[PDB]
Design a protein around this nucleic acid. Structure first.
Ligand SMILES: [K+]
Ligand SMILES: [Mg+2]
Ligand SMILES: [Mg+2]
Ligand SMILES: [Mg+2]
Ligand SMILES: [Mg+2]
Ligand SMILES: [Mg+2]
Ligand SMILES: [Mg+2]
Ligand SMILES: [Mg+2]
Lengths: 123, 171, 55, 119
RNA sequence: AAAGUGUACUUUAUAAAGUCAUUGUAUUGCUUACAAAUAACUAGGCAGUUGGGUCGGCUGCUAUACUAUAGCGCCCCAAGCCUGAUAAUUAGCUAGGCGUAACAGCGGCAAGCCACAGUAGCACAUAAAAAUUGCUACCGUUAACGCAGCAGUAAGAAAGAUUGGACAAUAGCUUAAGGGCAGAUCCAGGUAAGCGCUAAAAUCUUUGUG
C-alpha cells in the first residue's frame, strides 16, 4: 500500500521531520524523510528512520531510537533536518550542535496555561 | 536612472539634455520685475541656472554678473527680504560672496531705512568674509539709529534693534 | 533588517559584539557538517560501484 | 548657511549638503552620523550631476574609504544619497581658515538669530 | 548547485557574512501491453474513418543517426478498419474495513491517485498551480454576490456539534539584527459507539504512632 517514493523532488527540498503519533497530552514522534511542503502526517515518505518519546520515565530519562547508517546516507543526499531534529542529533552526537541566535523578547509568563482553558477556569 | 559607473556618465548626459542657457530669460525677467513676487521668481531662476550648469560640466558661479542688477531692482521695488535670503544662501544661488556685493546690499537696505535688515545682511556677510570693513559697520550703526528713531513707537522694533546691536558689538 | 544608532553608547556596542559572535559560530558549524557529508558521500558511492560490478 | 552642514541634522539628505556648498562640494569629505568618528569612513566627491527634472537632487560619484583605504577599484555613484544623517567634514586646512567663521555662526545661533533647524 | 562568479547593495574604532543579479553535457518525456459492473426486448458501426507520400508542428547557441511519438493539422493517393462492435443503465478508483472455517459477498474511520469549486466556452499556467486570478454568455437573488474553507442561519429529512481558546508544541510562509503571519494543527464545549474508575464508615489504612 504505502510504497516509498523513489524519484527525488525537482522543485522542493527534502527534510527530516517529526510526525505527531501520540494521544491527548501524551505526545509521541516518528522521524521520516518527507517533502518539505506537504501535510504533517502525509503518507508520502522515502523512509522511516527513528522514533522519540519526549516524556520522562521512572528512570528519569527520555528514550530515542535511530538508524545510524541511514541517517548518514540521507544527510549526504541533501536532507535538511528541522530545528528540533538538529537538537536530537546534536545531543546524540551524530553531528555537532547548531548554535542559536541571541534572544531579547521577554519570555512568555503563561506558556503551559495560556492555551489550556481548563486550567484557566480553575484560575 | 543614472549609470552606476563614472565611465558611462558622458553618454547619460548627452541623451535628452535639459535646458541649460537661462541668461536671456534672466535678463528679461530682471527688467520686467516690479514687485516682490517677481523678485522671488528671479531667485528661483538663479537657482535653476546654477543647478542646470552641471549638465554641461561647469561648476563656477554662473550668477556672477546679474547680481548687481538684481540688487538695483530690489532697492527700487523697496523689498529687502530677497537680498537677505540671497546672503543667507549665497552659495546655493551661485553668487560668490565679496565685499563690494556686501557694501551694495547694505547701502540699498540703508537707503530704504531698514537698519534691522542692514544689520542682518552685515551679520550674514560676516560668515563669508573674515574681515568686515569698519566704515561699513559705522554705516550700519547709523542705519540702526535711523531705524530706531523712525519706528521708536513699536516696542518689538526696539527689541529687535537692541538685539541686533548687541550681535554686531559681540561679533 | 539591521540595527543602527546615532548614539555611541553601551547598547550599540553590545549589539555589534553579540552579532559578530553568532555569525562566527554559525560559519564554523557549517564547515564541519559539510566535510562529514562529503566523507560519507564518497563511502556510499564506492559501495555502489562494488555492488554493480558484482551484479 | 554652508556652515550649518557641519552638524548632522534629521531628515537632511546628502543632496542638501552637496548643493549648499561652494563648487558643489567637489573634492570634499562627507560621512554619516551613524558611522563611528574614529572608523575613518567617508566619501570623497569627484563629480556631481543634478537631477534632470527636480533640479533639487544630485547624483554624486567618488570613492569610498574604510580605515583610510579604498574599498572598490573604480569610482561609483553614491547609492545612499537618499538616506539621512550626512554631514560635512572639512579638511584640516579648511578648518583652520574657518575657525573665526564657525565662532561667528555659533554665536548667532546661540543668540537665536539663525535657526539651524529651518536651514 | 549544502556551489561558483560580480566596476552591484547592506552592516563594521569590533567582520565574519548575507542580500540582489546570473550560470548545469546536451538544460523539466513520451509510447506500448494486460486486468477491472450490468448489458442482445441494443446488430450492424466508421469516410479523417484504416493505411501510404510531400509540407507544417516555433521559443535557438556539442557531433552523428538521411529527420529519430502520433491523422496531431493541410494537400494528394489507395480502399481499408471494427464486429459481443456501436448505443444505453449505474458507479469516483485503490485500500483499510464488516460477516464467513474458507471460497465468496458488501463498501462509515487513517492514507495514496484522479475530478471539480452556481452552469458553459476561453486567456494565462510550460514543469510542481487556479475555492479565496481574469474575459464572455447564461441561471438564481439583489452595478454586485454564489461558504462543497472554520463557526453559524433557513428549508428539507426518521436522523446532521460552539457564531469557543491559543500559536505553548509539531509542520509550513517570510526574514541574517532573532521578529511577524496562520479556523492547518494543538486544547476546550456538545452528542448513552467503546475502554477504565468512583457513588459507606471502620483503631484518622501498623506503608501507622513514637
Ligand atoms: K465544471
Ligand atoms: Mg456520481
Ligand atoms: Mg466552472
Ligand atoms: Mg493549491
Ligand atoms: Mg453553494
Ligand atoms: Mg461550513
Ligand atoms: Mg516554527
Ligand atoms: Mg436509544
Amino acid at each position: 500500500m504505502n510504497n516509498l517514493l523513489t524519484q527525488l523532488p525537482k522543485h522542493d527540498l527534502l527534510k527530516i521531520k517529526l510526525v505527531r503519533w501520540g494521544f491527548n497530552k501524551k505526545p509521541f514522534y516518528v522521524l521520516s524523510v518527507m517533502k518539505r511542503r506537504q501535510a504533517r502526517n502525509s503518507g508520502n515518505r522515502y523512509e522511516d528512520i527513528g522514533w522519540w518519546d519526549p516524556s520522562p520515565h521512572q528512570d528519569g530519562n527520555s528514550h530515542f531510537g535511530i538508524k545510524f547508517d541511514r541517517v548518514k546516507y540521507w544527510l549526504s543526499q541533501g536532507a535538511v533536518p528541522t530545528e528540533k531534529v538538529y537538537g536530537l542529533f546534536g545531543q546524540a552526537g551524530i553531528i555537532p550542535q547548531k548554535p542559536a541566535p541571541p534572544k531579547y523578547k521577554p519570555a512568555d509568563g503563561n506558556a503551559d496555561t495560556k492555551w489550556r482553558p481548563e486550567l484557566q477556569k480553575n484560575l | 536612472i543614472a549609470p552606476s559607473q563614472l565611465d558611462k556618465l558622458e553618454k547619460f548626459v548627452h541623451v535628452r539634455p535639459p535646458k541649460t542657457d537661462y541668461e536671456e530669460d534672466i535678463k528679461q525677467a530682471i527688467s520686467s520685475v516690479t514687485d516682490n513676487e517677481g523678485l522671488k521668481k528671479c531667485l528661483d531662476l538663479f537657482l535653476t541656472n546654477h543647478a542646470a550648469q552641471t549638465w554641461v560640466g561647469k561648476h563656477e558661479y554662473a550668477n556672477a554678473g546679474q547680481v548687481s542688477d538684481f540688487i538695483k531692482v530690489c532697492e527700487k521695488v523697496g523689498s529687502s527680504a530677497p537680498l537677505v535670503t540671497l546672503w543667507q544662501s549665497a552659495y546655493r544661488y551661485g553668487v560668490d560672496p565679496t565685499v563690494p556685493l556686501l557694501r551694495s546690499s547694505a547701502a540699498a537696505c540703508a537707503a530704504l531705512g531698514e537698519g534691522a535688515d542692514a544689520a542682518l545682511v552685515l551679520l550674514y556677510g560676516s560668515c563669508y568674509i573674515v574681515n568686515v570693513p569698519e566704515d561699513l559697520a559705522a554705516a550700519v550703526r547709523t542705519a540702526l539709529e535711523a531705524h530706531e528713531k523712525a519706528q521708536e513707537g513699536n516696542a518689538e522694533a526696539l527689541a529687535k534693534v537692541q538685539k541686533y546691536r548687541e550681535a554686531l558689538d559681540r561679533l | 533588517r539591521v540595527f543602527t544608532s546615532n548614539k555611541m553608547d553601551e547598547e550599540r556596542a553590545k549589539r555589534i559584539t553579540e552579532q559578530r559572535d553568532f555569525i562566527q559560530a554559525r560559519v564554523e558549524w557549517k564547515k564541519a557538517t559539510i566535510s562529514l557529508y562529503k566523507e560519507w558521500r564518497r563511502t556510499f558511492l564506492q559501495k555502489d560501484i562494488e555492488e554493480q560490478h558484482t551484479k | 548657511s554652508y556652515l550649518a552642514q557641519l552638524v548632522p541634522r534629521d531628515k537632511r539628505t546628502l543632496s542638501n549638503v552637496i548643493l549648499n556648498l561652494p563648487n558643489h562640494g567637489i573634492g570634499g569629505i562627507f560621512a554619516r552620523d551613524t558611522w563611528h568618528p574614529e572608523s575613518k569612513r567617508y566619501w570623497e566627491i569627484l563629480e556631481v550631476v543634478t537631477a534632470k527634472d527636480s533640479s533639487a537632487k544630485v547624483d554624486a560619484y567618488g570613492y569610498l574609504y574604510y580605515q583610510g583605504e579604498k574599498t572598490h577599484p573604480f569610482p561609483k555613484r553614491v547609492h545612499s544619497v537618499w538616506r539621512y544623517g550626512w554631514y560635512w567634514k572639512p579638511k584640516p586646512e579648511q578648518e583652520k581658515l574657518l575657525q573665526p567663521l564657525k565662532e561667528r555662526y555659533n554665536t548667532l545661533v546661540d543668540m537665536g538669530i539663525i535657526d539651524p533647524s529651518q536651514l
